[PDB]
Amino acid sequence: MAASTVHTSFILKVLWLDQNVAIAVDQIVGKGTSPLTSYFFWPRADAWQQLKDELEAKHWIAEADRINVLNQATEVINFWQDLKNQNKQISMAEAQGKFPEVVFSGSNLEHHHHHH
């Protein structure tokens, strides 16, 4: 069969908390997306480190891809840290204006029980 090479791109998600923030990446599959990594809660846990660690463990990820999502993830973390010190009290929408490709979410439902 004449099979072509597809690029499984990766999308960054950010769960925004009151005094915390979590990050989680998905893989773009032929029929949509699939949860690649779970929400790592920064700064309580080493979010960025565990995120890249997952990407380094998943050896089917390319350098360009992992570095890209790590760059924007770093910007989200620096953005958050910037807010925590200045108490800017900005809105979720204002963060969306900064990160157009990043999917933000809220802790409305249970993410403590591992089903994602």
From Swiss-Prot:
Probably a ribosomal protein or a ribosome-associated protein. Coiled coil: none annotated. This is Probable small ribosomal subunit protein cS23. One of its GO terms (cellular component) is ribonucleoprotein complex. One of its GO terms (biological process) is translation. One of its GO terms (molecular function) is structural constituent of ribosome. Belongs to the chloroplast-specific ribosomal protein cS23 family. It holds the Pfam family PSRP-3_Ycf65. Gene3D superfamilies: 3.30.390.140. Part of the 30S ribosomal subunit. Keywords: Ribonucleoprotein, Ribosomal protein. InterPro entries: PSRP-3/Ycf65_sf, Ribosomal_PSRP3/Ycf65.
